[PDB]
Structures are given as structure tokens and as C-alpha cells.
Nucleic acid binder design. Structure first.
Ligand SMILES: [Hg+2]
Ligand SMILES: [Hg+2]
Ligand SMILES: [Hg+2]
Ligand SMILES: [Hg+2]
Ligand SMILES: [Hg+2]
Ligand SMILES: [Hg+2]
Ligand SMILES: [Zn+2]
Ligand SMILES: [Zn+2]
Ligand SMILES: [Zn+2]
Ligand SMILES: [Zn+2]
Ligand SMILES: [Zn+2]
Ligand SMILES: [Zn+2]
Ligand SMILES: [Zn+2]
Ligand SMILES: [Zn+2]
Length: 713
RNA sequence: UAUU
């Protein structure tokens, strides 16, 4: 297996009495009461059990004290001094396996979090007082804490994580003032979010005949909107002339209406492990000093441990990266970029770069020649025979000029087309990719002008040569794979920039890497559309190997909703694998279905630092019902590691869990755009890359001639 | 769009 270690976490133990159980009763009153809240008060009258925290819904009762039998209390109610007889009938104990166990624990912990007086939303606690406003980006970022609870045979654990909820400063009242019928045309059909209650509404009309001074009727009381929002949310309405949004009746003053913004926010969110540990200990000490939360915690006779729990784990040994003539170890820092310097790629076309073209404008011939010299040198050092491409010098840097050059050049049937661009323009890049992959079938390479002027142009040209070798459909390196007839599938999905109502699903499939070591890639728009792609992959596999694969490892990017995706995806997959292998009158293959999730909620560290690549936590902090584990595969220079969560829904592989984990760590070594281990298995990162390319730039399905090439890299 |  690997080298075992002990790792710091972000969980604290909830210690209770050694013999500590939860008692559930059903409660009823001799004088019947049509209102449950009155019953709650009537039971609250009993102080013998009041000091102990108890959960009463008007019928179900959860408490700690176990009574002698079915027990009955009696007293006089506050209203009319009516003699009431409460019949508290014993139901039983909540088993450690019942989900009501964790539901009761969640309600208790939420009651405790209430003492901190933080806005509670789902499993998150926010501090709106501590909002970070940004008028530069017109957005407010609220810090907060994400919470989770885990059950183990040894105890009960409670974990926290830093979280940031972002929202837009722009309000619908501001949009209406910018327009000032046209306001109604601009506002109707939009979705707004109330800043006092995490609810969104579709505005269907705007009533100009009503104001915040108008009144509505609740369940019994009549009240104005100003009074309602001052008494229910302590929110003051300053503008009295504004109209009302009718969806419910909302106030516009109180209604609120990516990849570079992600960079800015990451600059504001990247955190050293020590800083995250400090903020976590601060939150713990805050909850510990608050007497309101401590009262709730102590009433149930359970104590937070101000000390962090640590887990047993193991670090996978370094894996061997194979090239033509030899193989190298990955290293303690799982990066091998230093190694292809004076090393040859695994699979190289004997033809080499026998026919390709280069399109560039007349102004940038000098930088183009520099780039081409670097490419020749680097690709020759890699084993890639590159010859002189076809010169395609255009005059203007416009998009139509590039498109026309491509269409005039394709007539010579080139293996590849490299295009030198002036700047970082998504428009011309998307148009180039669309003309290359969708309308025609030519793998292309784009180089930003700033790249040519880079001082370290030689290592850049080496990485570009690796990318080009992949674009041709050849293999730069390979892992040691002790399995026969294995097909690894990755699959992911992406939203579209042109239309948010469509999504693209990309599927990547290996072809018995110990022999063929190539990949097959399909995309389709969102009638389950994934099985056609799986069938295409199996057909290509049997057309290349004269046989179907014996084992299949399916990596799924998603996620709880496990039950839904388990049922639908896995059941249909198994039935249709039965069917497809029955077409060949064969038995269905060994199948492993794993859901890959980047769990930013659960973290763990080694000696207070980021764990090294290959670290694994199996079945301690993981979910009890699931057969799953955590893996750290990609080391991070800066920031905090987000471990990957691999959840094996179905497994008929006949492989030990350690073997499955080692195979997954191996498959994490095969993303050719990155000279090291990636955060996810390689096929999954390929699927994400292809789906993002289709949904962001291509907006259409690429031609089927590129099925065996890494054109999307 | 060398890479994310
Ligand atoms: Hg249990
Ligand atoms: Hg307008
Ligand atoms: Hg009311
Ligand atoms: Hg050409
Ligand atoms: Hg899909
Ligand atoms: Hg993925
Ligand atoms: Zn019950
Ligand atoms: Zn050779
Ligand atoms: Zn050739
Ligand atoms: Zn120069
Ligand atoms: Zn995904
Ligand atoms: Zn255990
Ligand atoms: Zn488009
Ligand atoms: Zn690329």
C-alpha cells in the first residue's frame, strides 16, 4: 500500500456521557388543544425536564431523561387555571443507525448556533454585519462558516470550513431610476433576491398604485409594508414613493437582481493553511465564549472538544512515468517537468510534422520566427520531427482574414494549423476554433503574442510541442498499468454562454492503455444522451481491439442527490451494458462507477501543512453509508488544498480498496497539458476541458473525424 | 489563447 501518517483535520469531537442515548416520546393532553404552540408552552411549564434541553413539536418529543414507564403529568394552565393532564407516552430510543439520530443532532447544533446570532441558511452561518462591500466591482461578499457532522463508531464529530457568499450591489430600485412603462418592460421577467431573506422571486408586474405605506393583512393582523419589514426583519424603508413588485409584494429598495471575476475573488479568497486554522480556532473560541450557545450545548450534556481530531491515513508511493527508451519516477513533488529536458516522448508520428501551416499577420513575422525556431528546437529535443510549415501571412489582424486564410489553407490538407494572435481576444479565438473543428476537421494551435516575447520561450515551446503531439493523437508518456482490457471513462458537463438553457456533456474513454494507449472523445448536447456516447466509445474500442473491454472504470463529475444519480445513471448503465455485451452474446463486464467531487468543505493537513501528493484518508471522516475515500493528488504551492472525494457507488471489479485507490492515483498522472498530477483523474479533466471548450467557444458539436485526437487541449 |  503506502506510508501511513497521522493528519490534522478541521473537526472537533462532541463528547457526551459514555452511556448516552436519546429518548423519544409521543405527547398528548387530556384537554385537547387545536394549536401546537400552546401545547409547547404547556409542556414548557414543567421545569423538572426544562433544564435539560428537549425538542418538542407539539406531538413528538426528544429528550435525555428516560422515565419509569408511560408517564403522565398534571397541572393548571396559565390561561384559565384549567387542570391539564399531559400524557407522555414512551416510544423508544433512537438507534445509532436511524437518520432521525442525525436529524436530532442537527437541530441541536442549529439551536446552539442560534446563540451566536448569525444569519443561519441551510448548513451555513453568515455575519451580515461583517459584510465586505466592493464598490469597485459593485458586489458584497459576506464571510461565513459551513458546518457538517460526521458519525463514527468511536464518537460524533463536528467540522467547520470558511465560506464566502457573494451578491450583487445593484438593486431593482436603481435599475428603475436609471431608465427614468419602460421600467415595467425592463423589470418584468427578471429574478430578484430579497436581501433580508434568502428567497428569489420572479417579478410578474409592478404596481405603481401602491407604496411602502400601503397595508396588507397577515393571518390576522393588518399592517403596512414599512411596519412589516421593520418588525419582521428590522429593515427600514427610506423611499416612500417607490412602486411595489408583485410576484407576494416586494419593495424595490429591498430586492437585489465570470472567469476573471473568479481570479479577483481568488485573490481575495486564497488562504494559507495557518491563516485558515487561525480563523477556525477564532470561530471555535467565539462559540465557546458565547453563553447562549454554551447553554444549549450543556443542557444536552455534550461538550465540544477545543482540540482538533486527527486521522490515520496513508501516502501512495511515487509512480513511474514512462517514455520511449526509459522511465523516470515522479518525485516527492509530483512534477516531472524537469525530466523531458533531454528525454524523448513515448509515441511520435514517424511522419512527424510532415504537413502543417502557420497563419500570422505581416507585422509579427519577427516574433513568429522566434516562436518557430523555439518550436523546432524543443520538438526535436522531444523526438518530434518538425519540418517547415506553410507560410500564411495576412495583412490585417481581423477575424475574417484569419478565417479566409484557414479556408484557403485547408485545401492542402494540413495535419495542424498554428495561429499567432495579437492579444487575448475571445471573439477571434472562438471563431478560429469554430472554423477549425466544427465546419472543418483540422486540429489547431493558438499562441498569444505575449508568449513569443517571453524570456523562457524554450520551456514554453517544449510544452507547446507536447500539446502539438497530443493534438496529432499521439502519447507523450504513460503510467505503469497492471491491468488487462481496462477502459477508463470520464464524463463532465458544462453550461453554455450563448444559452443558459443548454448544456454540453463530454465523454472521454481510454483504449487498454497497456497496448493502444489512446483516447476517444465525444460531446453531445443535453432522452438520456450519455448512453449514445458510451456506445460509440465501446464500438470504437472493439473496432480497434477486435474485442470489448473486460473492465470499465467510470469517473463521474457531479454532486444528497446520490440516490437520484445512482438510480438513474448506474441502473441504466448496467442494464445497457448487459444489452451491449449480449449483442456479442457476452457477459457484462466488471464495472466501477465512481463519483468525483472536489470537496472544499472537508480538509485535512499533515504537521500543519499541505499534504503531499498521494495522501489518502479512507473511512474515518468519510460518510458511513458510502464506500468512498479522499485523495490528495495535486500539490499546491500557495493556498489550501481541496482534497478530491471519490465515491464508489457500484463496484464489480474484484479489486481491493487500496488497489482501486492506487489505480485512481495512477489515472491522475495522465493529463498531458500538465507535467504532473492533476486534482482529478485524467479522463475527467479531459472531459471538463472538452465540455468547457464546446460550451464557451464552439457552441456546436465538433466533427467526428477528431475522435482519436486531443484537439480540445 | 503554452499552462490552470
Ligand atoms: Hg451509528
Ligand atoms: Hg428604460
Ligand atoms: Hg400578523
Ligand atoms: Hg495548409
Ligand atoms: Hg448531457
Ligand atoms: Hg472532472
Ligand atoms: Zn414518534
Ligand atoms: Zn524508437
Ligand atoms: Zn506525412
Ligand atoms: Zn527579436
Ligand atoms: Zn463537472
Ligand atoms: Zn472507522
Ligand atoms: Zn458561438
Ligand atoms: Zn491549448
Amino acid at each position: 500500500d503506502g506510508v501511513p501518517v497521522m493528519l490534522q483535520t478541521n473537526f472537533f469531537r462532541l463528547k457526551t456521557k459514555p452511556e448516552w442515548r436519546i429518548v423519544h416520546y409521543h405527547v398528548e393532553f387530556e384537554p385537547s388543544i387545536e394549536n401546537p404552540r400552546v401545547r409547547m408552552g404547556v409542556l414548557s411549564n414543567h421545569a423538572n425536564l426544562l433544564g435539560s434541553g428537549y425538542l418538542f413539536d407539539g406531538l413528538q418529543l426528544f429528550t435525555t431523561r428516560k422515565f419509569e414507564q408511560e408517564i403522565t403529568v398534571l397541572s393548571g394552565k396559565s390561561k384559565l387555571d384549567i387542570e391539564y393532564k399531559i400524557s407522555i407516552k414512551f416510544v423508544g430510543f433512537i438507534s445509532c443507525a436511524e437518520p432521525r439520530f442525525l436529524q436530532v443532532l442537527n437541530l441541536i447544533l442549529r439551536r446552539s448556533m442560534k446563540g451566536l446570532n448569525l444569519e443561519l441558511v441551510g448548513r451555513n452561518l453568515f455575519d451580515p454585519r461583517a459584510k465586505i462591500e466592493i464598490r469597485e466591482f459593485k458586489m458584497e461578499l459576506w464571510p461565513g462558516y459551513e458546518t457538517s457532522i460526521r458519525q463514527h463508531e468511536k464518537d460524533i464529530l463536528l467540522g467547520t470550513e470558511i465560506t464566502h457568499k457573494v451578491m450583487r450591489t445593484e438593486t431593482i430600485y436603481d435599475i428603475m431610476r436609471r431608465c427614468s412603462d419602460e421600467v415595467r418592460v425592463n423589470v418584468l421577467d427578471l429574478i430578484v433576491l430579497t436581501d433580508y431573506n434568502n428567497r428569489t422571486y420572479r417579478i410578474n408586474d409592478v404596481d405603481f398604485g401602491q407604496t411602502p405605506k400601503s397595508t396588507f393583512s397577515c393571518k390576522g393582523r393588518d399592517i403596512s409594508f414599512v411596519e412589516y419589514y421593520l418588525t419582521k426583519y428590522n429593515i427600514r424603508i427610506r423611499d416612500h414613493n417607490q412602486p411595489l413588485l408583485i410576484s407576494v409584494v416586494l419593495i424595490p429598495e429591498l430586492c437585489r437582481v465570470n472567469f476573471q471575476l473568479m481570479r479577483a475573488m481568488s485573490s481575495y479568497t486564497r488562504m494559507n493553511p495557518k491563516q485558515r486554522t487561525d480563523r477556525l480556532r477564532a470561530f471555535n473560541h467565539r462559540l465557546q465564549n458565547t453563553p447562549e450557545s454554551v447553554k444549549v450545548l450543556r443542557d444536552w450534556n455534550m461538550e465540544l472538544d477545543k482540540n482538533v481530531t486527527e486521522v490515520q491515513g496513508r501516502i501512495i508511493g511515487q509512480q513511474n512515468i514512462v517514455f520511449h527508451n526509459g522511465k523516470v519516477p515522479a518525485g516527492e513533488n509530483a512534477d516531472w517537468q524537469r525530466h523531458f529536458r533531454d528525454q524523448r516522448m513515448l509515441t511520435t508520428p514517424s511522419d512527424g510534422l510532415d504537413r502543417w501551416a502557420v497563419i500570422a499577420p505581416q507585422r509579427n513575422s519577427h516574433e513568429l520566427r522566434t516562436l518557430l525556431d523555439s518550436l523546432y528546437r524543443a520538438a526535436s529535443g522531444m523526438g518530434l520531427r518538425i519540418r517547415s510549415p506553410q507560410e500564411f501571412i495576412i495583412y490585417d489582424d481581423r477575424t475574417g482574414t484569419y478565417v479566409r486564410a484557414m479556408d484557403d489553407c485547408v485545401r492542402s490538407d494540413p495535419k495542424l494549423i498554428l495561429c499567432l494572435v495579437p492579444n487575448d481576444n475571445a471573439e477571434r479565438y472562438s471563431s478560429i476554433k469554430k472554423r477549425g473543428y466544427v465546419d472543418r476537421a483540422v486540429p489547431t494551435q493558438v499562441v498569444t503574442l505575449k508568449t513569443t516575447k517571453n524570456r523562457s520561450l524554450m520551456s514554453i515551446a517544449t510544452k507547446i510541442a507536447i500539446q502539438l503531439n497530443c493534438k496529432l493523437g499521439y502519447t507523450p508518456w504513460m503510467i505503469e498499468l497492471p491491468l488487462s482490457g481496462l477502459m477508463t471513462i470520464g464524463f463532465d458537463i458544462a453550461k453554455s454562454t450563448r444559452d443558459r438553457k443548454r448544456a454540453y456533456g463530454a465523454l472521454i474513454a481510454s483504449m487498454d492503455l497497456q497496448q493502444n494507449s489512446t483516447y476517444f472523445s465525444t460531446v453531445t448536447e443535453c432522452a438520456n444522451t450519455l448512453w449514445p456516447m458510451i456506445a460509440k466509445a465501446l464500438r470504437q474500442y472493439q473496432h480497434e481491439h477486435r474485442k470489448l473491454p473486460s473492465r470499465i472504470v467510470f469517473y463521474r463529475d457531479g454532486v444528497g442527490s446520490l440516490k437520484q444519480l445512482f438510480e438513474f445513471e448506474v441502473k441504466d448503465i448496467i442494464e445497457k451494458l448487459k444489452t451491449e455485451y449480449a449483442r456479442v452474446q457476452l457477459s457484462p463486464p466488471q464495472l466501477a462507477y465512481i463519483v468525483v467531487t472536489r470537496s472544499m468543505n472537508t480538509r485535512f493537513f499533515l504537521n500543519g501543512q499541505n499534504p503531499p501528493p498521494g495522501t489518502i484518508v479512507d473511512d474515518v471522516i468519510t460518510l458511513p453509508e458510502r464506500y468512498d475515500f479522499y485523495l490528495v493528488s495535486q500539490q499546491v504551492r500557495q493556498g489550501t488544498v481541496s482534497p478530491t472525494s471519490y465515491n464508489v457507488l457500484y463496484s464489480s471489479m474484484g479489486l481491493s480498496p487500496e488497489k482501486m485507490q492506487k489505480l485512481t492515483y495512477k489515472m491522475c498522472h495522465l493529463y498531458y497539458n500538465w507535467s504532473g498530477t492533476t486534482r482529478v483523474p485524467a479522463v475527467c479533466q479531459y472531459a471538463k476541458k472538452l465540455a468547457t471548450l464546446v460550451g464557451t467557444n464552439l457552441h456546436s458539436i465538433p466533427q467526428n473525424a477528431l475522435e482519436k485526437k486531443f484537439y480540445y487541449l
